[PDB]
Short mmCIF file of C-alpha atoms and ligand atoms in Angstrom, two decimals:
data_model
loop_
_atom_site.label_atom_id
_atom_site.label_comp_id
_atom_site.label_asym_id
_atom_site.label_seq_id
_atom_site.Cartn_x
_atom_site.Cartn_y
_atom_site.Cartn_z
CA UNK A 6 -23.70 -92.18 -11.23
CA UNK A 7 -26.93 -92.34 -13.19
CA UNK A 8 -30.44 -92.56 -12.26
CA UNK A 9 -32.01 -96.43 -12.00
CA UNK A 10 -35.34 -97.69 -12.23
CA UNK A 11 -37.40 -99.83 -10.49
CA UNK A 12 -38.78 -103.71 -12.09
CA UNK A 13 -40.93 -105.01 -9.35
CA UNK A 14 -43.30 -108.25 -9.55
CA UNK A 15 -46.24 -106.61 -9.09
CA UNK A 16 -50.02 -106.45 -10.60
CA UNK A 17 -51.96 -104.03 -11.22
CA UNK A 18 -55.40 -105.61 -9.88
CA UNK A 19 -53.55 -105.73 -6.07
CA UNK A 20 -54.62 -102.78 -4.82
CA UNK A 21 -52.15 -103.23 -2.25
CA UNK A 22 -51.18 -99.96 -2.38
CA UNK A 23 -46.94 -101.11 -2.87
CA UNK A 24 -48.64 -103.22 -5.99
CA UNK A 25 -50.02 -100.05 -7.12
CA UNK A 26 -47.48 -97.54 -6.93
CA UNK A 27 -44.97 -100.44 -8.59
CA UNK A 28 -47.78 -101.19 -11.74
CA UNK A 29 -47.39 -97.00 -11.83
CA UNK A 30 -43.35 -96.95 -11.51
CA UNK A 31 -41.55 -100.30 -12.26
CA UNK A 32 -41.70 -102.49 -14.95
CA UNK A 33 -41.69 -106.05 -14.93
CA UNK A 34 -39.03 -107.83 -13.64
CA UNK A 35 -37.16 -109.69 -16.21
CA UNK A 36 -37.98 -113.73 -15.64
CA UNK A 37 -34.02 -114.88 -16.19
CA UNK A 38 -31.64 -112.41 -15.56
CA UNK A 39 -28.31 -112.14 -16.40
CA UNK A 40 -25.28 -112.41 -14.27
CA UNK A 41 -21.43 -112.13 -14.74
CA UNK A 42 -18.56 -113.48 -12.69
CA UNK A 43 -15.14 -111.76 -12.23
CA UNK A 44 -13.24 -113.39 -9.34
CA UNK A 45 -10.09 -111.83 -10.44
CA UNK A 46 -11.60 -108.29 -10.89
CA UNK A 47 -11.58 -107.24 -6.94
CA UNK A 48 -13.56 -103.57 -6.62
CA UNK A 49 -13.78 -101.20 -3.90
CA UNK A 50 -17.50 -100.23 -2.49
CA UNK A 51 -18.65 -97.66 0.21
CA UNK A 52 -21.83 -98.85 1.56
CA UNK A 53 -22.37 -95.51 3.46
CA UNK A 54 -21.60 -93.48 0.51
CA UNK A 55 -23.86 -95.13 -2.19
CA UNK A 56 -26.08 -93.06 -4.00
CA UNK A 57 -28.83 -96.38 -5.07
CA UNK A 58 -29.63 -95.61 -1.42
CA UNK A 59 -30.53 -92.04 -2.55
CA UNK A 60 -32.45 -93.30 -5.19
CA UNK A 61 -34.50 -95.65 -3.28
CA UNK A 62 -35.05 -93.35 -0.38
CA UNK A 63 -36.64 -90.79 -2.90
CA UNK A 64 -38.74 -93.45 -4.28
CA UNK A 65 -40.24 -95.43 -0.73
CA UNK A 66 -41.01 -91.51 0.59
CA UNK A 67 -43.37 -91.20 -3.19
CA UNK A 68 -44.30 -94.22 -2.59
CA UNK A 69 -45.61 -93.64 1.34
CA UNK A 70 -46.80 -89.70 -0.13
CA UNK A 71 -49.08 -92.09 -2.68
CA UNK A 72 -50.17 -94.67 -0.04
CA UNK A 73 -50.49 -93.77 3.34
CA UNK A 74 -51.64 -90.32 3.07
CA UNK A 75 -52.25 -88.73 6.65
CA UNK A 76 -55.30 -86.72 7.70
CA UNK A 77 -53.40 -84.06 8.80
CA UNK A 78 -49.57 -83.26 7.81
CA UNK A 79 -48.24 -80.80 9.80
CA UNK A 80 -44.75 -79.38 8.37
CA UNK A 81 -43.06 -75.84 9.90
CA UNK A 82 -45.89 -73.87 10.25
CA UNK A 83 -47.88 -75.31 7.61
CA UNK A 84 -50.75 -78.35 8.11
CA UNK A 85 -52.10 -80.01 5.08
CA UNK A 86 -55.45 -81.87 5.02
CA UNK A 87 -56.54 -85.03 2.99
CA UNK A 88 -58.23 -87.50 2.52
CA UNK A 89 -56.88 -91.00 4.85
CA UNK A 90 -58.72 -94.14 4.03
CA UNK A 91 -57.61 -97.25 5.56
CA UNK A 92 -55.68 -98.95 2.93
CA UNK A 93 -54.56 -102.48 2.30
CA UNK A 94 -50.18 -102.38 3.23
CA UNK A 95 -48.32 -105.38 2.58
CA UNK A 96 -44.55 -104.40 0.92
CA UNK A 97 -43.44 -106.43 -1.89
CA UNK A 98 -40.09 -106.60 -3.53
CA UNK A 99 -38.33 -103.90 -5.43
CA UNK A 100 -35.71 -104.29 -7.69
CA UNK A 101 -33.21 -101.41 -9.00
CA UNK A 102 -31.94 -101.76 -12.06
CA UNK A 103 -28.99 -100.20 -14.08
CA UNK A 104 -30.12 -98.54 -17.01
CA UNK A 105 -28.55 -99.24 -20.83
CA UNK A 106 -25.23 -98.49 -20.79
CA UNK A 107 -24.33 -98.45 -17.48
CA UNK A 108 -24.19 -102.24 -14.98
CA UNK A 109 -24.46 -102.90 -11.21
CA UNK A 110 -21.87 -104.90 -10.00
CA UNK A 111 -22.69 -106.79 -7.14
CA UNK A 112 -19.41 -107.85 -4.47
CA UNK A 113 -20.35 -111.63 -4.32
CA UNK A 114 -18.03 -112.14 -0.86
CA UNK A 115 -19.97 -113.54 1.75
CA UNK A 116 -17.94 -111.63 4.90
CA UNK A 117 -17.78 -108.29 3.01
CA UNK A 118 -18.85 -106.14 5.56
CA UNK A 119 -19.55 -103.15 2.88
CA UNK A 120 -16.54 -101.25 2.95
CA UNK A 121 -13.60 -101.54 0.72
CA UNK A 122 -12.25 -103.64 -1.47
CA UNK A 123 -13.90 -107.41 -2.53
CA UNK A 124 -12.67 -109.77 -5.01
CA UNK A 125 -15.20 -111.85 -6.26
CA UNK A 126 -17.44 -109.42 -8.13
CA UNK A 127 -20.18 -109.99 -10.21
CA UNK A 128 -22.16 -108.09 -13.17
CA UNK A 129 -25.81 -107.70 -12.92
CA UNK A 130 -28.95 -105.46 -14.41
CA UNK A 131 -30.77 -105.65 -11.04
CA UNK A 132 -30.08 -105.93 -7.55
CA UNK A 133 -32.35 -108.69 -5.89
CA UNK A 134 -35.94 -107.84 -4.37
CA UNK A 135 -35.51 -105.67 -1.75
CA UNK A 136 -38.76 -105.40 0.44
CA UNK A 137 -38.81 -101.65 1.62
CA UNK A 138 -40.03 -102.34 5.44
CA UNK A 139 -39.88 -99.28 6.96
CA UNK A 140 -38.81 -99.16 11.12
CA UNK A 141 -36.24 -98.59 13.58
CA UNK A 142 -34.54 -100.87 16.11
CA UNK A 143 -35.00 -103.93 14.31
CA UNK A 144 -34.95 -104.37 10.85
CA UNK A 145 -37.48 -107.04 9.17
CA UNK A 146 -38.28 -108.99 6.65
CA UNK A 147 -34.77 -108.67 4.88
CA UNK A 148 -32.01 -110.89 3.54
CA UNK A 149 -29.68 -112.70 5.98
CA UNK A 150 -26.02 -113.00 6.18
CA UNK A 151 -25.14 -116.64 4.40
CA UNK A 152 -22.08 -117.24 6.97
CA UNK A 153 -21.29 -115.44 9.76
CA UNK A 154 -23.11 -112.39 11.60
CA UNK A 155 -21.69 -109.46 9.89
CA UNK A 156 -20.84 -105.94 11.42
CA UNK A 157 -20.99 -103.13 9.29
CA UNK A 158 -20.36 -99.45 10.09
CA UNK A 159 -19.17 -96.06 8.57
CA UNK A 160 -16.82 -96.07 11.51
CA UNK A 161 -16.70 -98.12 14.51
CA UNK A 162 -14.45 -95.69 16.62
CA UNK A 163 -17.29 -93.01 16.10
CA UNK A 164 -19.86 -94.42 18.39
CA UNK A 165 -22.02 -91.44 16.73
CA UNK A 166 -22.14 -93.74 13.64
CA UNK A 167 -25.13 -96.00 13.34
CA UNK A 168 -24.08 -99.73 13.44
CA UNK A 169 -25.83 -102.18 11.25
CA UNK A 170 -26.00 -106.07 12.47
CA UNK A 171 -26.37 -108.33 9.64
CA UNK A 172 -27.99 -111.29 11.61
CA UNK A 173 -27.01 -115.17 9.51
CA UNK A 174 -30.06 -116.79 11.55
CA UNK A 175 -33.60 -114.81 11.40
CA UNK A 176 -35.46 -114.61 14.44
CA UNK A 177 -39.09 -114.41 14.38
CA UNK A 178 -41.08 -111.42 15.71
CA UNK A 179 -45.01 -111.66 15.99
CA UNK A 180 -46.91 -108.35 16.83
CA UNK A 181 -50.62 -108.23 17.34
CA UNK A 182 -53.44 -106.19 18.23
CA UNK A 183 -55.96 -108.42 19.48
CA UNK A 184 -59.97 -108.40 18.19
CA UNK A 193 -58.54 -100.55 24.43
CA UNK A 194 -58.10 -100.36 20.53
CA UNK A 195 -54.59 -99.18 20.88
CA UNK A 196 -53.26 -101.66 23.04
CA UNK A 197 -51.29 -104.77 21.21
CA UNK A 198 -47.97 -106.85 21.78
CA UNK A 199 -45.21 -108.82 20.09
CA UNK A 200 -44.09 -112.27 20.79
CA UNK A 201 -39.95 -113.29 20.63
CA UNK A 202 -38.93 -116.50 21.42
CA UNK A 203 -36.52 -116.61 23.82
CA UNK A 204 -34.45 -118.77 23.04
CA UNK A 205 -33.57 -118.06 19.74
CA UNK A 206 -33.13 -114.26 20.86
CA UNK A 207 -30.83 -115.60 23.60
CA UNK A 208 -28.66 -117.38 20.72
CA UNK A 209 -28.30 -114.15 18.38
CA UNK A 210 -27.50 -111.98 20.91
CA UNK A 211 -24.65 -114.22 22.17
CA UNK A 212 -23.17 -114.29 18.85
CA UNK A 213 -23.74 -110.66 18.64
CA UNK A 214 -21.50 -110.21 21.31
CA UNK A 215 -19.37 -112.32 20.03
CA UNK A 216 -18.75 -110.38 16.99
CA UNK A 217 -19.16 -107.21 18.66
CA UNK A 218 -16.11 -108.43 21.19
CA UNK A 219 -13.83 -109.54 18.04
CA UNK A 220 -14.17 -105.33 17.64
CA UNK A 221 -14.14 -104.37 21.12
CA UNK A 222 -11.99 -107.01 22.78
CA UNK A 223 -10.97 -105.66 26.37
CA UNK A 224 -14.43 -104.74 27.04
CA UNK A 225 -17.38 -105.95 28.18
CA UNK A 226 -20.28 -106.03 26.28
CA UNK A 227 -23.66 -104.66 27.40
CA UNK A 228 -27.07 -104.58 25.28
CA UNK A 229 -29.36 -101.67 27.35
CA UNK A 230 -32.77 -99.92 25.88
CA UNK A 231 -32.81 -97.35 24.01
CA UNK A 232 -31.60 -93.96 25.99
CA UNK A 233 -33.92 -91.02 25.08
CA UNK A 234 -35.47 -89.01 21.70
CA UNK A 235 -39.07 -89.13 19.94
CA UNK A 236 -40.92 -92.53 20.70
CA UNK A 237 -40.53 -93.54 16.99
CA UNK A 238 -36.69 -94.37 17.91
CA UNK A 239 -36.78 -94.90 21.63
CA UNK A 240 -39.42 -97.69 20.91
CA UNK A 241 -38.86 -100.78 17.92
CA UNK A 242 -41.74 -98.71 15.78
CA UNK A 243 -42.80 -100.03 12.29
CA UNK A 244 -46.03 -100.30 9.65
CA UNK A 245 -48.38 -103.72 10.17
CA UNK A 246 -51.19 -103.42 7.60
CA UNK A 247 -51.36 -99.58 7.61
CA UNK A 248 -51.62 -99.02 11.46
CA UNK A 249 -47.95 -97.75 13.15
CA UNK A 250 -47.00 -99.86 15.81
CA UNK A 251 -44.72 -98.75 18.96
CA UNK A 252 -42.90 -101.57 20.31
CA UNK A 253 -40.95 -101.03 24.32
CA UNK A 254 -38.22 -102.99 23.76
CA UNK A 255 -36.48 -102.79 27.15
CA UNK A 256 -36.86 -106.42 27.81
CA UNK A 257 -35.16 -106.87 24.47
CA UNK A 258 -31.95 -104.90 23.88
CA UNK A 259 -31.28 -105.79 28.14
CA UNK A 260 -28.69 -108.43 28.51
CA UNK A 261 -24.81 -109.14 29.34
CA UNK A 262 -21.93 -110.65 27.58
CA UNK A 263 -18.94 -111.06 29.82
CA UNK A 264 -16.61 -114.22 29.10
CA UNK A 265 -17.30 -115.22 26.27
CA UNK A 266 -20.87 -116.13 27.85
CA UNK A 267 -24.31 -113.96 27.20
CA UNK A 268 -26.93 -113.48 30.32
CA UNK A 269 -30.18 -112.27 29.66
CA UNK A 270 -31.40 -109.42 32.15
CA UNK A 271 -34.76 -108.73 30.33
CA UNK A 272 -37.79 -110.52 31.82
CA UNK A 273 -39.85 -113.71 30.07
CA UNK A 274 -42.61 -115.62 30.89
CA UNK A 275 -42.66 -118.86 29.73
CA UNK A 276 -39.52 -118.85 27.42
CA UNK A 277 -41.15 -115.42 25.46
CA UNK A 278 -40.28 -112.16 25.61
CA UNK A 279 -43.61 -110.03 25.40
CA UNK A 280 -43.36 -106.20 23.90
CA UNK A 281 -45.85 -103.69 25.19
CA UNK A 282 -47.11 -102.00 22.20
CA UNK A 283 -49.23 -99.01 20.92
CA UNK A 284 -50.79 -98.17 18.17
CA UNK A 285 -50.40 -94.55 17.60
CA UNK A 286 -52.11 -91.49 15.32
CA UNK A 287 -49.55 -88.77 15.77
CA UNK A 288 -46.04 -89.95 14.27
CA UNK A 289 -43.31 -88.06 13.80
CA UNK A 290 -42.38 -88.59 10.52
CA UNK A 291 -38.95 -90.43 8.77
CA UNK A 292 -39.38 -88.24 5.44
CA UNK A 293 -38.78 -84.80 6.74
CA UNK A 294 -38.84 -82.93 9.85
CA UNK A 295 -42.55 -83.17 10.49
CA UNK A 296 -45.80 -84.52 11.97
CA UNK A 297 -48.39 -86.67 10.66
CA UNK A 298 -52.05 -87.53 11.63
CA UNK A 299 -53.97 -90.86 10.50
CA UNK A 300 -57.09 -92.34 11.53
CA UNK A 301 -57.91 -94.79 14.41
CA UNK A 302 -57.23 -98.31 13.78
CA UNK A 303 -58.81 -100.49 12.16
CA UNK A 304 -61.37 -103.01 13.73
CA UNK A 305 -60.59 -107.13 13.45
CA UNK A 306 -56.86 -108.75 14.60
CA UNK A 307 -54.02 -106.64 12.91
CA UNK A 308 -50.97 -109.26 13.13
CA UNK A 309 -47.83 -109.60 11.52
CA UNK A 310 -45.41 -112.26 11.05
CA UNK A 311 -42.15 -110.51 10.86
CA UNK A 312 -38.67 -111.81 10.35
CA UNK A 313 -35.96 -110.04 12.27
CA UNK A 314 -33.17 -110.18 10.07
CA UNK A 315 -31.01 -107.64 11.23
CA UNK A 316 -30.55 -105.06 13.83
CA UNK A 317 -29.49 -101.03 14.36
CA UNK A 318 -27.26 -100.05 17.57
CA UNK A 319 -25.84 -96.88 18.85
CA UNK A 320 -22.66 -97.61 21.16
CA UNK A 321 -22.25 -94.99 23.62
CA UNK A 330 -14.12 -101.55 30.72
CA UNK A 331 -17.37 -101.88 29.35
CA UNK A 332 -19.14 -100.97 25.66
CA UNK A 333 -22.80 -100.71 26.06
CA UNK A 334 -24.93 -100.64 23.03
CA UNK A 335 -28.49 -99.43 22.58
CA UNK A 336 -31.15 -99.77 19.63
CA UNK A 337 -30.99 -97.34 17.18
CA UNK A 338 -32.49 -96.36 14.48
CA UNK A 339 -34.93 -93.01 12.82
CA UNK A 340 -32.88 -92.67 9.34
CA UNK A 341 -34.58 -94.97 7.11
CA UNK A 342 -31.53 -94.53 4.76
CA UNK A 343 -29.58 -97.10 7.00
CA UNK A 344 -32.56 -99.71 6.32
CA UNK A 345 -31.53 -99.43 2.30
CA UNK A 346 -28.03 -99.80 3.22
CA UNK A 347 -28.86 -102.89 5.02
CA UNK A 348 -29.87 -104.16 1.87
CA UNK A 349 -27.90 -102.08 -1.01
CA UNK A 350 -24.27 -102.69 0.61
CA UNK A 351 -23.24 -105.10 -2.19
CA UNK A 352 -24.08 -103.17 -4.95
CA UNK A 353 -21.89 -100.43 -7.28
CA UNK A 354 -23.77 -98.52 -10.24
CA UNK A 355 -21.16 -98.26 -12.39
CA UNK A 356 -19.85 -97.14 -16.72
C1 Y26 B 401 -34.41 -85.31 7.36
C2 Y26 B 401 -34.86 -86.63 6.74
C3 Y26 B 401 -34.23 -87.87 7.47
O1 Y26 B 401 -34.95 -87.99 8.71
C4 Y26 B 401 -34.17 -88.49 9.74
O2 Y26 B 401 -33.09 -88.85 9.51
N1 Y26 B 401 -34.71 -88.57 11.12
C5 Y26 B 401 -33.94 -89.01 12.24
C6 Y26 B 401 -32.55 -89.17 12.48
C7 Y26 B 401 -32.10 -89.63 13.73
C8 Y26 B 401 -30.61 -89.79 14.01
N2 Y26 B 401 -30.24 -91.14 13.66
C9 Y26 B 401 -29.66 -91.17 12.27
C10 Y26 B 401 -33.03 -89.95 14.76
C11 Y26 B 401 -34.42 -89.79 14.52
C12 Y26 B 401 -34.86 -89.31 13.27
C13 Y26 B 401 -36.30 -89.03 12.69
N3 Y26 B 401 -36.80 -90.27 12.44
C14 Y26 B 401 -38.25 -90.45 12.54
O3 Y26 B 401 -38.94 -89.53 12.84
C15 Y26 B 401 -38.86 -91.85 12.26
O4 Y26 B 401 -38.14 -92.76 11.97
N4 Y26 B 401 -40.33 -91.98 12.37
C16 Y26 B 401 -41.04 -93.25 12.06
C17 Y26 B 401 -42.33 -93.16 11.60
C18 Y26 B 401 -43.04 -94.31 11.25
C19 Y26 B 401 -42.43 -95.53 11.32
CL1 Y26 B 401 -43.31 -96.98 10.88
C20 Y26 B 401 -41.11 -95.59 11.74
F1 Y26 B 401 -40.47 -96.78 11.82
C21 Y26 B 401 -40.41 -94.47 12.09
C22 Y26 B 401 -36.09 -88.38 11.35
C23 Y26 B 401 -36.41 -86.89 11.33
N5 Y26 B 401 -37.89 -86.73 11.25
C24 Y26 B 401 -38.58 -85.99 12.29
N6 Y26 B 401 -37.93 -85.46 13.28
N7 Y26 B 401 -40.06 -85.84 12.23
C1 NAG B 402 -14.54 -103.06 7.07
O1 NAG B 402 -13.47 -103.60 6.31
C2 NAG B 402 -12.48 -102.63 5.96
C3 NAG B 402 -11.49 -103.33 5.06
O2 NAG B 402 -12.19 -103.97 4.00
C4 NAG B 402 -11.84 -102.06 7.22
O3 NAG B 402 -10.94 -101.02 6.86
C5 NAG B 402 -12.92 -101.48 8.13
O4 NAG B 402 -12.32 -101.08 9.36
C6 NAG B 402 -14.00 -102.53 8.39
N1 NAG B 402 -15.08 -101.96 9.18
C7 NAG B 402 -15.84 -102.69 10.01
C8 NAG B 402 -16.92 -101.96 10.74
O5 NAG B 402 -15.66 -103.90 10.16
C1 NAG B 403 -23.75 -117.19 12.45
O1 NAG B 403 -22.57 -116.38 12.75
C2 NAG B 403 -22.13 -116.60 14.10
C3 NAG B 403 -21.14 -115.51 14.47
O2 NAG B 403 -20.60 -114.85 13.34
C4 NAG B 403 -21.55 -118.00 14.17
O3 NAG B 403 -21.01 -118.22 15.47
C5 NAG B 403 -22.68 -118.99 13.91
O4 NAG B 403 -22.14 -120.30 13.86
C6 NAG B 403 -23.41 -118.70 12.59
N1 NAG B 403 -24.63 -119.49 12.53
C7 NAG B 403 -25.16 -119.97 11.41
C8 NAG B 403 -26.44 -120.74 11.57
O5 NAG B 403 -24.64 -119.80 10.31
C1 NAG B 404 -13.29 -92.88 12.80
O1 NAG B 404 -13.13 -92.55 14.22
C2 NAG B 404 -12.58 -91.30 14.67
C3 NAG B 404 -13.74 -90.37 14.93
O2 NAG B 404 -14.05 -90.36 16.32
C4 NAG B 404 -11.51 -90.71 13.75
O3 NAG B 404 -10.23 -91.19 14.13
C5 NAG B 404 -11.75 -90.97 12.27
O4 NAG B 404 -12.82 -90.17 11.78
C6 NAG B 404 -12.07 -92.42 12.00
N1 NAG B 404 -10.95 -93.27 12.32
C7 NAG B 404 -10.68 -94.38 11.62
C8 NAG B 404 -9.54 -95.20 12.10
O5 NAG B 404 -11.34 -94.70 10.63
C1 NAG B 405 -40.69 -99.21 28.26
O1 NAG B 405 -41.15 -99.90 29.47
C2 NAG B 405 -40.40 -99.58 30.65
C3 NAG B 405 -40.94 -100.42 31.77
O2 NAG B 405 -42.13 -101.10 31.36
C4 NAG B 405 -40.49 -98.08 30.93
O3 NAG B 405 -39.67 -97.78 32.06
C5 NAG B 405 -40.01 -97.29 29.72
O4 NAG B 405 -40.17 -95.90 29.95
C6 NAG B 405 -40.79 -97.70 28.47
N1 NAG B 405 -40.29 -96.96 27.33
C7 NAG B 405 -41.10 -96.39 26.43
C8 NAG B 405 -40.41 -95.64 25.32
O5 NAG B 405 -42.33 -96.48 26.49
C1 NAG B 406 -34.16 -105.21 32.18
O1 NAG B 406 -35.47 -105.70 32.54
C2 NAG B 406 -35.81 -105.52 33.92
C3 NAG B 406 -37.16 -106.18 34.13
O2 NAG B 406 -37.67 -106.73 32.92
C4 NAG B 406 -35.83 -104.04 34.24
O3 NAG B 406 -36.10 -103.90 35.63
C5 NAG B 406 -34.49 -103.42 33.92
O4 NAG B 406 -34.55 -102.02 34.13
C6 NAG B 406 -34.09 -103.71 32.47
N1 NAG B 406 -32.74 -103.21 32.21
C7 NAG B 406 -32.48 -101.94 31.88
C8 NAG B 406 -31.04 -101.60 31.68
O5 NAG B 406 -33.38 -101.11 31.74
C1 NAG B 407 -32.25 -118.31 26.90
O1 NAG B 407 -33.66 -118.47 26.98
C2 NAG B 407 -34.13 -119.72 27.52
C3 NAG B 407 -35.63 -119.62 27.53
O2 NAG B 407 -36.09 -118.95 28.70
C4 NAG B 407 -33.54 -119.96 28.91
O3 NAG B 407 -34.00 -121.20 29.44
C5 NAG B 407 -32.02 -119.93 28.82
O4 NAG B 407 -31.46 -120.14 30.11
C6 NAG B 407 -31.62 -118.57 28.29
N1 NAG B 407 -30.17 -118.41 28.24
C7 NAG B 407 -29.53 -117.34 28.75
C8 NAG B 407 -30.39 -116.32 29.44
O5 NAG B 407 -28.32 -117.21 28.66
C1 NAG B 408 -42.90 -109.55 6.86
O1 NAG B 408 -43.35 -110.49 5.86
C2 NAG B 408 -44.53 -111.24 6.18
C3 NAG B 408 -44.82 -112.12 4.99
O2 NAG B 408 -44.71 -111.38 3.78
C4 NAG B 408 -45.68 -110.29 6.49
O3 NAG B 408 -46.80 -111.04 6.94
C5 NAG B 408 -45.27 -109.31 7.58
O4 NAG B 408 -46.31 -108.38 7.82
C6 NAG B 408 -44.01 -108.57 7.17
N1 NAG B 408 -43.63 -107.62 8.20
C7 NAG B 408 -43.76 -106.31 8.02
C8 NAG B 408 -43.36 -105.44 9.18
O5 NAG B 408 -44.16 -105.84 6.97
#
């Protein structure tokens, strides 16, 4: 209804480039904040419909143009040179905050699945720190459910509609390219993977109850989506995830069809220099990677499917908008 602004936690001798574009942007987050109850108030919200994910999504694509600058940006007809030094790329929190005169109210019920209405309500000047990890697929680093697995959707009967999985238990992701320079992987347990997905299809079946419920790789389109692609340290990382999203939940039971080795699922991964880009309808051109171990230690936190008797659902992903909603879906700027 108004236009926010950003308090992040960040310093200006980081020149982590997130640090720097915050020291230029946000201003300090306030060391107590204030918060206000209502449990009688009960508001409606539209996660899909929220324009803090407008906001946001105009600031992460300045903050990328500032940051990761590619070699080459090539846009319709046009191609743009500049400058592309390697960088140093860790995200840190952001926090969006209500200017004077005007509040965020935050819905404060644990199963609201970010569509309309919620009774306990709350008054805030910020939202939490939201980390703005850019990918598809999978979505990292962000803040779990507190109870159960949550499904949220603009509108489960349109399987066009991106679904958002709001996992309760993270499950830890660790990509790596080793010290051919593009080649790298990514370690899942398992196990744990075996556990979420059950209760995936669990919650998925509470929506789809006659049906079965498949979990199948990603169908076709641009690498970017058909792989679980994302930013480790400034290099962009192409995950196949067909041993992942590759699995069966029939009776109330979940079978795993992807292969493991030794209780781990192992991703085949690239590092790539061409990427299509999330910002606009484009291409973009960095330099070759880095030399050393590039490794993250991601938390998968949540996930992106596509549904297409039996409901089969595939990764999704490509419209980084959905990642804010992941995060923004409690939150009304409001007065
Ligand atoms: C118009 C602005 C909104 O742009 C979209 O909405 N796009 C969209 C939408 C859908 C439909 N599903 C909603 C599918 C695919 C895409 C495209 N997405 C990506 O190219 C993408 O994510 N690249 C990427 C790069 C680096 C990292 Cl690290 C990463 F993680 C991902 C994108 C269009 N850009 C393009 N065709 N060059
Ligand atoms: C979300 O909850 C609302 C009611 O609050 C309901 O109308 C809608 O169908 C639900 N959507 C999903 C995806 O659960
Ligand atoms: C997470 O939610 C699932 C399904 O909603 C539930 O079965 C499970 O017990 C929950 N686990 C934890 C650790 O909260
Ligand atoms: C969502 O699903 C279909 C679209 O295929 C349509 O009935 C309408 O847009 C929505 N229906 C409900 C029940 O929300
Ligand atoms: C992922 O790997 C499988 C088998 O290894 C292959 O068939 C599939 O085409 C791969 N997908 C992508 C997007 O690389
Ligand atoms: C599941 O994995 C196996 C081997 O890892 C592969 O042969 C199969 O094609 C995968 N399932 C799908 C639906 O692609
Ligand atoms: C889950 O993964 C573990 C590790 O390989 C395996 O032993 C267990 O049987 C799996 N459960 C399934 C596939 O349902
Ligand atoms: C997730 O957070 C950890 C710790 O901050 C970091 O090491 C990792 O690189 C992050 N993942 C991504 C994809 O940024």
């Amino acid at each position: 209804k108004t236009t926010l602004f950003c308090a992040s936690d960040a310093k200006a001798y980081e020149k982590e480039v997130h640090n720097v574009w915050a020291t230029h942007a946000c201003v300090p987050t306030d060391p107590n904040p204030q918060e206000m109850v209502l449990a009688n108030v009960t508001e409606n919200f539209n996660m899909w419909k929220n324009d803090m994910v407008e906001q946001m999504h105009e600031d992460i694509i300045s903050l990328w143009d500032e940051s990761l600058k590619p070699c080459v940006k090539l846009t319709g007809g046009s191609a743009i040179t500049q400058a592309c030094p390697k960088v140093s790329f860790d995200p840190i929190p952001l926090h969006y905050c209500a200017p004077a005169g005007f509040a965020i109210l935050k819905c404060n019920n644990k199963t609201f699945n970010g569509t309309g209405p919620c009774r306990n309500v709350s008054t805030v000047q910020c939202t939490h720190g939201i980390k703005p990890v850019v990918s598809t697929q999978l979505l990292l680093n962000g803040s779990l459910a507190e109870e159960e697995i949550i499904i949220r959707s603009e509108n489960l009967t349109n399987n066009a509609k991106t679904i958002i999985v709001h996992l309760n238990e993270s499950v830890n992701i660790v990509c790596t390219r080793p010290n051919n320079i593009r080649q790298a992987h990514c370690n899942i347990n398992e196990s744990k993977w075996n556990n979420t997905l059950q209760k995936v299809g669990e919650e998925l079946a509470k929506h789809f109850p006659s049906k079965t419920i498949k979990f199948e790789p990603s169908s076709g389109g641009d690498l970017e989506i058909t792989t679980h692609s994302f930013n480790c340290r400034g290099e962009f990382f192409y995950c196949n995830t067909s041993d992942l999203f590759n699995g069966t939940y029939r009776n109330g039971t979940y079978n795993h069809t992807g292969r493991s080795s030794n209780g781990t699922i192992t991703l085949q991964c690239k590092i790539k220099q061409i990427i299509n880009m999330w910002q606009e309808v484009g291409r973009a051109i960095y330099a070759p990677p880095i030399e050393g171990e590039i490794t993250c230690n991601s938390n998968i936190t949540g996930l992106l499917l596509l549904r297409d008797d039996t409901e089969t659902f595939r990764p999704g992903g490509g419209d980084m908008r959905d990642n804010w909603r992941s995060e923004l879906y409690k939150y009304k700027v409001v007065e």
